[PDB]
């Protein structure tokens, strides 16, 4: 599970090229870690789903302050609804297709 540097760079630059609040949905929390680390602290402050972190705290925190929300497989559906029932993200970024690992 090494993410090719070319891919990480391309994804990070494309995310940085966004211009509005976004919900970057990764598959694994390690992909979140790598994107957060390589992402050079761009504006619209980023928000990361720490392994095990309940999504409620982070989602509510991001509701008030919008910006890049790098979630993961822990997204568990639900919705990143704006407080008064309005879309507070314009860009749903699927970094990679959440392919399940081989079960040998």
């Amino acid at each position: 599970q090494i993410f090719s540097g070319q891919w990480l760079k391309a994804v990070v630059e494309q995310l940085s090229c966004i211009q509005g609040p976004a919900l970057v949905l990764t598959a694994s929390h390690y992909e979140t870690r790598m994107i957060a680390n390589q992402l050079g602290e761009v504006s619209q402050p980023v928000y990361i789903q720490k392994a095990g972190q309940a999504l409620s705290e982070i989602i509510k925190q991001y509701q008030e302050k919008p910006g890049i929300l790098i979630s993961a497989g822990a997204s568990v559906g639900v919705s990143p609804r704006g407080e008064n029932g309005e879309q507070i993200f314009q860009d749903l970024i699927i970094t990679r297709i959440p392919f399940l690992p081989p079960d040998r």
Binding site: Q1, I2, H29, Y30, R33, A51
Partner: protein, 343 residues
Amino acid sequence: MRTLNFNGKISTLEPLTVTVKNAVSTSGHRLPRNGGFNAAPYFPGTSIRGTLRHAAHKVIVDRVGLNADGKSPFDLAEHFMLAQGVDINGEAETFAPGEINAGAELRSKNPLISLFGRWGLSGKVGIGNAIPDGDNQWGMFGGGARSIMFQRDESLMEFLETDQVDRLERLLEEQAEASVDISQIKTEQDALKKAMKSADKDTKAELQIKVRELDEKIQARKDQKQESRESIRRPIDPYEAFITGAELSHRMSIKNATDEEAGLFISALIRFAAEPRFGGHANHNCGLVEAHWTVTTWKPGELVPVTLGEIVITPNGVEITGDELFAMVKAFNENQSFDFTAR
């Protein structure tokens, strides 16, 4: 030109230990296990072979004799080739044409190298591992703790001058503050080790960089502690060892051994028996062993092996039975035609 199998037992007069680098998980000093975590520990044949090889080297240098000042005729390269088996000047190659049929003559001239071989010359002697007979017979010895002399006996305060008393009490206070802060450090370090034990794949390598940095920091904290860089009142790590009286079945074999080579090996056992020490912890007198070997040969083609004799190493003496072994030692001593220099 017979194959001699010394089959027998090593009784452990004082605990038998060995620090095999692979065996010792940094958790603690563990005796090299005979496969997996839970197998029966064995004493390596490597350590026994090294001890017997150094004994044979000492036999060879003593038999050659020393000069009036007491210097062996050999040079450094010759000693290293004899005992360590390593060539200093690089004149040792494997499967090289031209040294073929130089093995017979070289072995005849150098019974030691014939026995224990060199780089590219097969050693006729194989020194098996020591396998305990019974269950148990291994445990943790040593342990204890180095201590401050002056909390153990106050009388030594009366030898030390007042300035040295001041130095010793600044040494106590600095060792104790280093202790407490190294301690809280290790406590967060092991909570982080728990985090690692529940971290993911390829995220723990950054926490491991962090750990190596912590380590560097620790060693610097150590450095900048003036003279007493090292904790004095520190507990001593236990070393696993075979209990006193442990019976360890041993199988050694000299393949196609001439009477000269067998004589040199036996004399090497006579000289080893003067200090029957194996392994380490010789500070704790570890390694002392009394060992009895029934030497049996087996003429190829014959259905059963004949017993040439018995070699019993004991603190009271070395008993050699059977005229074959005496004749072998005498044959080796009498033969003046050995050369342990050049090639």
